[PDB]
Design a protein around this ligand. Structure first.
Ligand SMILES: [K+]
Ligand SMILES: [K+]
Ligand SMILES: [K+]
Ligand SMILES: [K+]
Ligand SMILES: [Mg+2]
Ligand SMILES: [Mg+2]
Ligand SMILES: [Mg+2]
Ligand SMILES: [Mg+2]
Ligand SMILES: [Mg+2]
Ligand SMILES: [Mg+2]
Ligand SMILES: [Mg+2]
Ligand SMILES: [Mg+2]
Ligand SMILES: [Mg+2]
Ligand SMILES: [Mg+2]
Ligand SMILES: [Mg+2]
Ligand SMILES: [Mg+2]
Ligand SMILES: [Mg+2]
Ligand SMILES: [Mg+2]
Ligand SMILES: [Mg+2]
Ligand SMILES: [Mg+2]
Ligand SMILES: [Mg+2]
Ligand SMILES: [Mg+2]
Ligand SMILES: [Mg+2]
Ligand SMILES: [Mg+2]
Ligand SMILES: [Mg+2]
Ligand SMILES: [Mg+2]
Ligand SMILES: [Mg+2]
Ligand SMILES: [Mg+2]
Ligand SMILES: [Mg+2]
Ligand SMILES: [Mg+2]
Ligand SMILES: [Mg+2]
Ligand SMILES: [Mg+2]
Ligand SMILES: [Mg+2]
Ligand SMILES: [Mg+2]
Ligand SMILES: [Mg+2]
Ligand SMILES: [Mg+2]
Ligand SMILES: [Mg+2]
Ligand SMILES: [Mg+2]
Ligand SMILES: [Mg+2]
Ligand SMILES: [Mg+2]
Ligand SMILES: [Mg+2]
Ligand SMILES: [Mg+2]
Ligand SMILES: [Mg+2]
Ligand SMILES: [Mg+2]
Ligand SMILES: [Mg+2]
Ligand SMILES: [Mg+2]
Ligand SMILES: [Mg+2]
Ligand SMILES: [Mg+2]
Ligand SMILES: [Mg+2]
Ligand SMILES: [Mg+2]
Ligand SMILES: [Mg+2]
Ligand SMILES: [Mg+2]
Ligand SMILES: [Mg+2]
Ligand SMILES: [Mg+2]
Ligand SMILES: [Mg+2]
Ligand SMILES: [Mg+2]
Ligand SMILES: [Mg+2]
Ligand SMILES: [Mg+2]
Ligand SMILES: [Mg+2]
Ligand SMILES: [Mg+2]
Ligand SMILES: [Mg+2]
Ligand SMILES: [Mg+2]
Ligand SMILES: [Mg+2]
Ligand SMILES: [Mg+2]
Ligand SMILES: [Mg+2]
Ligand SMILES: [Zn+2]
Lengths: 208, 234, 138, 150
RNA sequence: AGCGCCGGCCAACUCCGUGCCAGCAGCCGCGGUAAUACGGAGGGCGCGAGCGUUACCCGGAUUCACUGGGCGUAAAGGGCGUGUAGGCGGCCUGGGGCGUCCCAUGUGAAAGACCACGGCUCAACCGUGGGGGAGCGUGGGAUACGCUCAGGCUAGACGG
RNA sequence: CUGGUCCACCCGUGACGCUGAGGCGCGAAAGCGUGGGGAGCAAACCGGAUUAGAUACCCGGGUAGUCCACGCCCUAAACGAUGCGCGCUAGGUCUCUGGGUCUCCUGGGGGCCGAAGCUAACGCGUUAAGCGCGCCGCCUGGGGAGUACGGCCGCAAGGC
């Protein structure tokens, strides 16, 4: 069971706003807005110079807490990444962006990743035509990620897919706001992304 | 500037206790003394004087260094025959290496010379008229040749490098070229532009530094008469 | 008695260049001469020449260095920075062409002795053959 | 322009009648991440003055690292005192695999991929110097060429 | 929704209780009243159907060092010879090819591992295909080095 | 009576070489056996002092022993606390011992100081602790312990 607890608190521990809520982390309320210092009774005290370790950790904690993936899950990927050919850093990110639950979010069918996940666990999603409820399912390039033929009518699907009308999206993706379907065109490149995370440090955290 | 058969002075110097390295410049062994091969003395002269004109005709400051009492004067003279600074008393540790600091002394020097020419001379207890006079006394003993240095030199002219090793070492470190009239006991390698020959014996120090300062005047443009320090060879 | 003449040669060369000698002699032998051809060709040494010191045949090895350097210690760079014996009596070292070493990513060399003659690691690879890994130089 | 990373700061002690009288030593690396680093070890009565003095000594002690796409042109081992350091070239994606001391130096020299190993005495100060010296001894084909060309 | 941590190593601090006690403790070490180290609480860090603990193997440990260590004063040169076996062996030529090197070829069960595609909605799991050195056997080839047999030589050694 | 060794001449042999597990021999002092010897010295011991108390240091005596022969023991701060051989790598100075044309040159030893270099440092530095090759011996945290057990050796003490 992926985390499941106060999130606009983790953003606070990372000193950088994380989109764990979606549209509230946009409207002067992500807490990071007027209260960006870490959580707990000691949040406003001066931070002692972080150990090399500390940095490499909190960093990984950002990158992971973003996609809301468990350490076990997370670690397996990084390993799979290390093994594969090519710059482990980037590749690792490509794999992270290939998680169905994530693409669903990146297409706007859902606001946040936590919500994007649930839409998958409830079959409201469809890869290449068939239903898929594995949020960790890996979307390969060429796959069409649509909305349950019988879920296009769902209230929530309307809003999100509506606000998606007229709104450019990921250069490796393509949203056909009409049939409520999308298309994973290519594995994003580090360039394609703008994540507040230096993967280098992550690779270093595991290097230890 | 020039000269060839100079066996009238140089060559052969130092007993038999040399430095193996300076062996390239030795001609033969005579009467327990090493006789320098002048051909090479000459070759180095050219090579070196050439570097002299270089610095000369560009406005480059050459710092002269000679404490060896066998030339402590020849230096302070030929050196004055050019805006070239000189050190003939005691090479103070860190003049180049700690130049910034050692110059604060130069400031206090000329500054004291002020006080000793103003209404404040005969002012305050003569207990200060003693301490301050002595202060100027010493400053004027050493820094009276070093005062002409606003910045680090562009070369160093050392008489006996072995003797002025502390100077050479400071130069070397600051990549400041090292011009030196070294000999038998000295280490060649430590000197960039060498002039192998008697580092001792006034008749030798005078001749060399002489023509050297001539070429400095000439090269930089000024044309001057023969050296006003040939009387010192007495 | 000399136990490893090749190692002795490698050393005379090593020893002489550290004091920056002009030349330096080593008792002559065909094999040594073969090593020298390579050192020469590769440009680690100005060259070498046969000679007859005291009746017996030697090999003047003309060492070579870099230019004078600045700052304290003007001593030039060595052309032969490293030169070490690999194979040795009582522990000979052999290699297949597939197992020939790449000394300092090519910036260096390794002299093997093969049934096709003495050759650098490249030469050896070229004629696709291995042998006794005589020494390395760089 | 230049970046500084503090390698270590220690509080040495000396004896006097009355008691111990302290000092602080600081190791600082300074690099442009463009193939230029400097090491400085400054000591002073206070930690700050120490650090500052160290930074200042570092810039006076620079090395031109022959970067060839985030890595070193070739491998080298340098022993400084009883500390030995092993530097090995690495393909991109590898990263900087090193202890905290060599890392700081390597990273500011603008190295991005390198294999490393601390052998012998792992005294920070001495490992640091072994490193700078290793970097300082690095050569390039271009260099070997001019050298053996003659 | 639990479990372990928050003195340093090692991510995470504050109050009360207790006063060399009760207790903690992987190592260094904490506790004799104002304990970030004991017990509680509030916070916080780390994982999460799991988290800790003990046991055992490899690692870090170039701390048995072949790669890759050492022995003057830190374990560590034998009290000194003589010499057996063994290890090692100047310069030149020739024969043989033992070591060494090179082609080719036969072995090298499947499975596993690696790579690529595939089947269970994914994965774990599974299938198909692809690569496979090494190690030995065989056939042919090379001869610089090492070995061996022949001859020669004086620079090692030994004689006068 | 006898071992080693150094120099000169470059006369003879043609690697006949290096190292060396076991083995064998040598091996200070004390100690052991048999028999001699015994001046001086001196464990033990007998006394006198000192002292809080001295089974001590100081003083007076004094046996083994110290000395010899033959046999045994086999240890040590048996030390340069550095195994043996060979080649290579600035010099200065003193000294012992050869040969030479005898200021000096050239060998073989003994000391200092020092190039390069090496070393944790002290230091080492053509007597290496430098650069290399060959072979032997040995080390692997402290205590337990050079102990226990076993074997071997010894008259024993005890040694390995
Ligand atoms: K070194
Ligand atoms: K011993
Ligand atoms: K043959
Ligand atoms: K026993
Ligand atoms: Mg990878
Ligand atoms: Mg001076
Ligand atoms: Mg002189
Ligand atoms: Mg060698
Ligand atoms: Mg070498
Ligand atoms: Mg090897
Ligand atoms: Mg401190
Ligand atoms: Mg460079
Ligand atoms: Mg070492
Ligand atoms: Mg250690
Ligand atoms: Mg912490
Ligand atoms: Mg506890
Ligand atoms: Mg309290
Ligand atoms: Mg507490
Ligand atoms: Mg604790
Ligand atoms: Mg507590
Ligand atoms: Mg699970
Ligand atoms: Mg272990
Ligand atoms: Mg190991
Ligand atoms: Mg161990
Ligand atoms: Mg080894
Ligand atoms: Mg060790
Ligand atoms: Mg001891
Ligand atoms: Mg010892
Ligand atoms: Mg000892
Ligand atoms: Mg011994
Ligand atoms: Mg003995
Ligand atoms: Mg042979
Ligand atoms: Mg096969
Ligand atoms: Mg196979
Ligand atoms: Mg198989
Ligand atoms: Mg599939
Ligand atoms: Mg298969
Ligand atoms: Mg023969
Ligand atoms: Mg003869
Ligand atoms: Mg004959
Ligand atoms: Mg022997
Ligand atoms: Mg034998
Ligand atoms: Mg005895
Ligand atoms: Mg006796
Ligand atoms: Mg008796
Ligand atoms: Mg008596
Ligand atoms: Mg008493
Ligand atoms: Mg009494
Ligand atoms: Mg008595
Ligand atoms: Mg003995
Ligand atoms: Mg002794
Ligand atoms: Mg031995
Ligand atoms: Mg001597
Ligand atoms: Mg001597
Ligand atoms: Mg020390
Ligand atoms: Mg010395
Ligand atoms: Mg030696
Ligand atoms: Mg040593
Ligand atoms: Mg032993
Ligand atoms: Mg134990
Ligand atoms: Mg023990
Ligand atoms: Mg013991
Ligand atoms: Mg004993
Ligand atoms: Mg018995
Ligand atoms: Mg005993
Ligand atoms: Zn938020």
């Amino acid at each position: 069971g992926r985390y499941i607890g106060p999130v606009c608190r983790l953003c606070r521990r990372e000193g950088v706003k994380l989109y764990l809520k979606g549209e509230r982390c946009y409207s002067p309320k992500c807490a990071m807005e007027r209260r960006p210092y870490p959580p707990g009774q000691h949040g406003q005290k001066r931070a002692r110079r972080p150990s090399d370790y500390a940095v490499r950790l909190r960093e990984k904690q950002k990158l992971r807490r973003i996609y809301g993936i468990s350490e076990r899950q997370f670690r397996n990927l990084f390993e799979e990444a290390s093994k594969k050919k090519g710059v482990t850093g980037s590749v690792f990110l490509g794999l992270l962006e290939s998680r169905l639950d994530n693409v669903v979010y990146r297409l706007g069918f859902a606001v946040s990743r936590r919500q994007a996940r649930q839409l998958v666990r409830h079959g409201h999603i469809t890869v290449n035509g068939r239903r898929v409820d594995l949020p960790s399912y890996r979307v390969r390039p060429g796959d069409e990620i649509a909305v349950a033929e019988k879920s296009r009518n769902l209230e929530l699907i309307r809003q999100n897919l509506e606000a998606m009308k007229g709104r450019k999206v990921g250069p490796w993706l393509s949203l056909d706001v009409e049939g409520m379907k999308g298309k994973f065109l290519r594995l994003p490149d580090r360039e394609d992304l703008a994540l507040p995370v230096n993967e280098q440090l992550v690779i270093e955290f595991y290097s230890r | 500037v020039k000269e060839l058969l100079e066996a009238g002075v140089h060559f052969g110097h130092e007993r038999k206790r040399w430095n193996p390295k300076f062996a390239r410049y030795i001609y033969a062994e005579r009467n327990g003394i090493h006789i320098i091969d002048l051909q090479k003395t000459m070759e180095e002269l050219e090579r070196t004087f050439r570097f002299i004109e270089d610095l000369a005709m560009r406005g480059g400051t050459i710092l002269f260094v000679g404490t060896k009492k066998q030339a402590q004067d020849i230096v302070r003279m030929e050196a004055e025959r050019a805006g070239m600074p000189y050190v003939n008393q005691r090479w103070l540790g860190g003049m180049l290496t700690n130049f910034k600091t050692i110059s604060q002394r130069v400031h206090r020097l000329e500054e004291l010379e002020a006080l000793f020419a103003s209404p404040e001379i005969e002012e305050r207890p003569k207990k200060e008229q003693v301490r301050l006079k002595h202060e100027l006394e010493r400053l004027q003993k050493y820094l009276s040749g070093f005062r002409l240095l606003k910045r680090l030199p562009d070369a160093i002219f050392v008489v006996d490098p072995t003797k002025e090793a502390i100077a050479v070492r400071e130069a070397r470190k600051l990549f400041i070229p090292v011009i030196a009239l070294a000999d038998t006991d000295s280490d060649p390698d430590l000197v960039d532009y060498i002039i192998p020959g008697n580092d001792d014996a006034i008749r030798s120090i005078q001749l060399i530094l002489s023509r050297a300062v001539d070429l400095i005047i000439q090269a930089r443009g000024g044309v001057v008469e023969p050296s006003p320090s040939y009387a010192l060879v007495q | 008695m000399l136990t490893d003449p090749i190692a002795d040669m490698l050393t005379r060369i090593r020893n002489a260049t550290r004091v920056y000698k002009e030349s330096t002699d080593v008792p002559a032998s065909r094999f040594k001469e073969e090593i020298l051809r390579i050192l020469a060709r590769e440009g680690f040494i100005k060259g070498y020449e046969r000679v007859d010191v005291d009746g017996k045949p030697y090999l003047r090895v003309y060492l070579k260095y870099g230019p004078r350097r600045q700052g304290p210690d003007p001593r030039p760079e060595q052309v032969i920075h490293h030169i070490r014996r690999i194979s040795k009596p009582g522990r000979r070292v052999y290699v297949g062409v597939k197992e020939i070493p790449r000394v300092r990513r090519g910036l260096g060399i390794a002299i093997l002795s093969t049934s096709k003659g003495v050759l650098t690691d490249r030469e050896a690879r070229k004629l696709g053959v291995g042998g006794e890994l005589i020494c390395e130089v760089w | 322009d230049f970046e500084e990373k503090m390698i270590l700061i220690r509080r040495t002690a000396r004896m006097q009648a009355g008691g111990r009288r302290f000092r602080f030593g600081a190791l600082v690396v300074v690099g442009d991440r463009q193939g230029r680093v400097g090491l400085g070890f400054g000591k002073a009565p206070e930690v700050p003055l120490a650090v500052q003095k160290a930074g200042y000594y570092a810039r006076r002690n620079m090395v031109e690292v022959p970067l060839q796409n985030g890595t070193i042109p070739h491998e080298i081992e340098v022993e400084f005192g009883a500390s030995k350091i092993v530097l090995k070239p690495a393909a991109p994606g590898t990263g900087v695999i090193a202890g905290a001391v060599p890392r700081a130096i390597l990273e500011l020299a603008g190295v991005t991929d390198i294999l490393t190993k601390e052998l012998g005495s792992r005294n920070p100060i001495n490992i640091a110097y072994a490193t700078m010296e290793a970097l300082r001894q690095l050569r390039t084909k271009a260099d070997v060429e001019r050298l053996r060309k003659g």
